[PDB]
């Protein structure tokens, strides 16, 4: 879920704001 | 095998800072 898109291409603060509870 | 592991250590520190109050869920896979 986590690792593939965001370790191959850079995730942004608004995009990781979605992987919050 | 290592860059995936090293990057998850930075990914979980940015998650922690952006979610803040709501906490978060970290799972590697899926
Ligand atoms: Zn590092």
From Swiss-Prot, chain B:
It comes from the Eukaryota. This is Insulin B chain. The lineage of its organism: Eukaryota, Metazoa, Chordata, Craniata, Vertebrata. The chain holds residues 25 to 54 of 108 of the full protein.
């Amino acid at each position: 879920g986590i690792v593939e898109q965001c370790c191959t291409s850079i995730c942004s603060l608004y995009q990781l704001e979605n992987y919050c509870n | 095998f290592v860059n995936q592991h090293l990057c998850g250590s930075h990914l979980v520190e940015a998650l922690y800072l952006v979610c803040g109050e709501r906490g978060f869920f970290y799972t590697p896979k899926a």
